[PDB]
Ligand binder design. Structure first.
Ligand SMILES: O=C(O)[C@H]1CNC[C@@H](O)[C@@H]1O
Ligand SMILES: O=C(O)[C@H]1CNC[C@@H](O)[C@@H]1O
Lengths: 655, 655, 335
């Protein structure tokens, strides 16, 4: 009677097609075959076909039901076979996809499921280029879905089949259109469709409709909902969601059901005053996050998403840009749950300072880009956290000019979802910046040359020249190795093998001050919350890594800048953090010590003797200058005021 | 006034897309990037995108002409850009392709030509699998073609635009339909089309037609030709060809012209008596040849084709199977010139003893297969040497079953060219063998197990059970290293690291005797004329090589079997060849010496002392038994009779 | 010169058999234009070097072909200075075998050149920069300044791919991916003329008879190869310079060889054809029509200038005099 969702992750037989003999090894999903070679900095890591095969017992009692194989993600092309007969293809590495196998299997026996995954280079599947790894394989879950022959359809771009369209939302009332896809393979007849909105045990809406479904029908039903005096999803202040059950009934029996969240809110972006959520100004304190991790590549487990979100909330993050592609359903779920305003985007990624192009002007590429956009929007439609749809990152006009195609994507986004604005992330001047509703730039003033001050100049000049633009900062950052430490502050070469941590700290303190004074900037996103994989990189403390994270690739170590942001953004958790603790060897005659704290002041101790109190500045920073160390070991301690104080401590050597 | 054909092979800038920085190196076409890694036996050799860029000066005086970039071959996908704007894509590694660039260039300046070549794995472009290397890149010539605005069209699958259809051919008369594609971009008006057939300075046909061509017209004209008492293209006996000039004229001025050969013949294949050319039985003494070579991979220069053909003619080859794909125009030209009956085929290649599949049942694969077949037939239509179109090699029915698709390809071949029969090369029993007009099998009785005798049993049983089949042998062979030698004859393990030359010799002598007695076998083709590259191989004297050649990979050394065939097939060139000369170390008490000769007998000398004469058998082999060597060095000499004899000699050591 | 190490007994046997005067050497090899050092000054290295020298001399003592023992190739004094150790090796060679002189192959000025009885230099004037003429200047100046030195040329050469061809003569970048065959031909003709006029040079050795393996190379028509051979790595193809030397050095075997046959595509308005022959003269034919005879010069070279080709295919033939002549032929395309 109930819909079943069966995980098919364990024990698949794997081999590369370049291994011609046919023998296989066991693997377990999520899986990528690029977790060792790409992460070792091998620039020509394996990009081609890997094959997964599993024997699936089709239970006799599933006869009469409908059966679907749903894939959460396979990078980048998947060809699926049942009993070695081809059933379909998916092109795109980040969107879910589904095939019905109801009439393709033999009931009561083992059937072969074969997936031939290809992450070889293509010129007709975005992303074509990018500063990250194109990890190959079935790197998200695989499900066997089992439903009634009359069901809420899972066949609409592999979405849940329900779109809760937020037409009008205010504190007085919300009008929602529940769009429901129905799929019928039963004999001609009827069913009753019910849409139930609840808050815990309390019933908020219950709307019903009798529907006549022809054999073979695949149709869209639209049920209007009205909620009086709604409780709004209000970011981290109150991430409230209703639950919606959508169900089908025949003769007073429920025969199918799906649940989706309903987090109601309204928003706008003001060119002069920034982002407003539910009628109130909201600074977007944002970071970016790639979907990979040390040692496992992009084969992330649920605890990895959970941990990433825990670290961001610890830091006081209230906004995120999930670059550079559609990410996991579970990850958008955590954004919903924790109230994090989210920018979600398609992988329409340009070259940046590197070679080749993000756009190749041929129908196959362009049609496939539209498919990946429709996938993004339909598959992730109901997540309240998503407040912006991103259409590109660092495209450029030279050669194949993407401006007209990006206009087509913008119009398609607005058609698919008029309830959210489009955005984009640019490193260019010119017409590419004037298509999406909001615009943002990737700025590295003070890292890739210049000084942080030119970010202030760029922001002010652009805002004055183009007062209609809603200006954001879609990336800003600096590299750091936790193993590169020096007593003095000196700007390093960005592309070199020396990325002292103190420069990243300096960079973020200076850039944050510029942002904090400019409320017309509707959101800013640190590049990046975590170090991440990019095989071609040859910089910092090891190849193959982009080290602009606030936290290391294995999520183990928070860099000093993490705590600068935590003090400023997470003000209600008491803390004190001494900066430059990893710089154990000191040689400067005049030592400077610096702490980040939520307290109004702090006290410094050197070798157990107080150096006195210093006040925190407006950026939660306390600084002591001309501190005198003695030759050899020195114990440095900082303490907040109060009867029960907080402390941080380190032993440094002075010579 | 004249059509120009300008080679664009020298000095291109190259880089891999996995090299992200943008710097390049000079390369010169023909080029493959897999001439070192695949040939070293690296099984995961580079399969992905390589980029070639060249500045092309567009001369001011070309304004008013039409300009085309014609590619003879790029493996396997090519995306072409002019001034970095995409102009088109080709999918398929072995057929020619063309783009007009007339209205895409700036006249009087340098224009960028960029080719982005991809040999990454695909499941929608045959060949999907195969016992050979998928060498990537622009491995054949690139041309700039310059024509009048009214021209014999080069735009019909990049063919010459002229199809000389051999409708009826006999010694009394030949009826030919000259099909001519015309392309017009001039203002509405007329031109005169002339088709001129000559034999040296003698005029055989001259047919003319006035044609009215609308602006933008792309049309087909058909001019009937009648040749009384023709001189026929008759294989190696008389490879005679007429020359055909096809020209366009305006106001008594020739404005365009193309030349094509006309080699007239008729043929049939008899299920009981074999192949008949021009009404006369012709044993097809065939070999196969791949288009690669030591050190250069498939980036063959003209002297490489010329040399390969010289070696085959030296051996008395009169038939060839140019496996496993469309090969170079120049190579089919040499077959025409030297009278070699040719099997040409599409790369519809199955796995053999290896994993995966030759057929993936999806529209993209199937449509692309049809395109590669149409390319093959239209591009190579006028070569008299081609007498069979091959549709597949070792497909199998399990999983995706290609039988119905192969029937579609057979019907398409017959539509495109009713003047040649279809054929195929099978390693299967069953329905796949009953589609093409002729059928052939790949047989390794005595190499991959069993004994040569079971080839005789298979041939006789099949012929008796299925008397309607025209049976051929599309492959037969055995491996040999010239560096593996042993005094005794012992069958080696096929997959092992020991391939003694004497077993390959034994294999071919025994298999040839079986074939020679069976005239119902219409043709047999040795696998292979030359050792060739197959990165995944781990056998013989080094990895990465299929060593079943009669001649080594560098074309330097002829193995003993080469001379067995030469004695039997090239009977009018006097020769004597002592076998087993490379086996320098002898230990058998009773030595056997063996020579291949065109003479009726030969004489053996050991240490300058005659051992007497022995008669050649029916297979041009002379054998001396129980020859007594003395400890240490022995000089062995064999001599033909006559006042001016031929000799072969070797020094062996006996111990 | 069987560089850069003791080679097979069977190879020295063939030198004995065929009468080839042989330089045999130990692998005491320096870096040349590359990094690191040929000499590391520690007892283990030095004692092992002496062992390899004693091995060379005792193992190959009886080969008449061996007339020189080579002690090093391109060592340099900077850092660990091998001069004193090379003197020790020289004294050891003379002790082990007073019946042969020592020699060495240098790319340096200074004291390293004054230890062995004969000395030789590796010279690439006209390949690694400069012009062949500076070889003549170096040889004459050294000989005048140091009249006691027995001066040889232990290496001279230029790279060539048989797949790199161009109608015009232009010096390529040595380290680049374009090594046109005609520059190697030019290089050897010019250097040979300089050597031939200087009998005080006791021996000269082409680097190299064959292309050979050097994994770190990234030049010519493929990586991993030193392409200065007169013959290709697989021993299949003789480059044009092979036949220049054959005409000059093997005078009693009649021959004619047309140069630049691999350069099939011609575009120069005025074509030059060049043949190497043992004959006193030869005749050129273009499309079956004689262009007349030309005399061979003192270096067995015959040259025809301002030859007129017609658009498209041209058949070029050269023939020696006599009732039974020798010929060489090629078809080129002119456009
Ligand atoms: O250079 C960087 O670190 C960033 C520049 N903007 C685009 C990012 O993908 C890239 O990682
Ligand atoms: O095993 C072999 O050597 C041959 C078997 N038949 C197919 C060929 O491609 C293959 O090379």
């Amino acid at each position: 009677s109930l819909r079943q969702d069966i995980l098919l992750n364990n024990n698949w037989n794997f081999r590369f097609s370049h291994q011609v003999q046919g023998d296989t090894r066991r693997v377990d999903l999520p899986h990528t075959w690029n977790a060792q070679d790409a992460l070792a900095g091998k620039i020509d890591y394996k990009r081609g076909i890997g094959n997964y095969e599993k024997a699936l017992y089709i239970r006799p009692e599933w006869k009469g039901k409908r059966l679907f194989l749903r894939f959460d993600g396979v990078n980048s092309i998947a060809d699926v076979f049942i009993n070695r007969k081809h059933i379909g293809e998916h092109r795109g590495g980040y969107g879910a996809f589904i095939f019905e196998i109801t009439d393709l299997v033999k009931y009561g026996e083992k059937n072969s499921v074969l997936v031939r995954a290809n992450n070889g280079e293509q010129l007709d599947i975005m992303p074509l280029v990018g500063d990250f790894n194109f990890y190959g394989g079935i790197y998200r879950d695989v499900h066997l879905l089992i439903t009634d022959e009359t069901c809420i359809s899972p066949l609409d771009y592999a979405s849940p089949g329900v779109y809760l369209v937020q037409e009008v939302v205010s504190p007085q009332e919300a009008k929602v259109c529940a769009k429901v896809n129905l799929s019928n393979r039963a004999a001609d007849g009827t069913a009753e469709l019910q849409v139930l909105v609840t808050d815990g045990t309390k019933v908020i809406c219950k709307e019903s409709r009798n529907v006549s479904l022809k054999q073979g029908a695949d149709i869209l039903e639209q049920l209007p909902l009205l909620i009086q005096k709604p409780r709004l999803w209000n970011g981290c202040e109150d991430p409230f969601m209703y639950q919606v059950s959508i169900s089908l009934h025949k003769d007073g029996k429920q025969i199918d059901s799906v649940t989706q969240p309903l987090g109601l809110r309204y928003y706008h972006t003001d060119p002069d005053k920034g982002f407003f959520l539910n009628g109130k100004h909201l600074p977007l304190h944002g970071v970016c996050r790639h979907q990979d991790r040390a040692e496992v590549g992009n084969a992330l487990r649920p605890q990895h998403h959970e941990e990433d979100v825990a670290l961001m909330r610890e830091m006081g993050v209230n906004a995120i840009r999930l670059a550079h592609y559609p990410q996991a359903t579970y990850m958008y779920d955590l954004m919903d749950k924790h109230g994090i305003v989210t920018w979600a985007e398609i992988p329409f990624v340009g070259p940046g300072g590197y070679a080749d192009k993000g756009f190749v002007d041929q129908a196959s590429f362009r049609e496939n880009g539209k498919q990946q956009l429709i996938e993004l929007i339909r598959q992730h439609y109901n997540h309240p956290s998503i407040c912006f749809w991103g259409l590109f990152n660092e495209l450029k006009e030279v050669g194949d000019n993407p401006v007209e195609y990006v206009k087509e994507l913008n119009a398609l986004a607005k058609q698919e979802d008029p309830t959210r604005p489009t955005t984009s992330a640019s490193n260019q001047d010119g017409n590419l910046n004037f298509i999406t509703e909001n615009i943002a730039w990737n700025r590295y003033d003070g890292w890739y040359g210049s000084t942080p001050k030119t970010l202030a100049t760029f922001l002010d000049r652009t805002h004055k020249k183009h007062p209609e633009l809603r200006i954001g900062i879609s990336e800003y950052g600096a590299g750091a190795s936790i193993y590169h430490q020096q007593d003095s502050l000196k700007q390093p070469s960005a592309s070199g093998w020396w990325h002292p941590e103190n420069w990243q700290t300096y960079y973020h303190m200076e850039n944050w001050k510029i942002i904090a004074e400019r409320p017309f900037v509707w959101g800013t996103f640190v590049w990046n919350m975590f170090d991440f994989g990019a095989a071609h990189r040859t910089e910092g403390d090891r190849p193959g890594i982009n080290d602009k994270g606030l936290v290391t690739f294995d999520r183990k170590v928070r860099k000093d800048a993490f705590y600068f942001y935590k003090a400023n953004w997470n003000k209600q958790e008491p803390m004190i953090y001494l900066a430059e603790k990893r710089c154990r060897l000191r040689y400067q005659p005049e030592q400077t010590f610096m702490a980040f704290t939520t307290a109004p002041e702090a006290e410094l101790f050197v070798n157990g003797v107080s150096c006195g109190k210093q006040k925190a500045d407006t950026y939660s920073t306390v600084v002591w200058k001309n501190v005198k160390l003695t030759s050899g070991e020195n114990i440095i301690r900082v303490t907040t005021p109060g009867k029960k104080p907080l402390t941080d401590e380190v032993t440094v050597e002075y010579k």
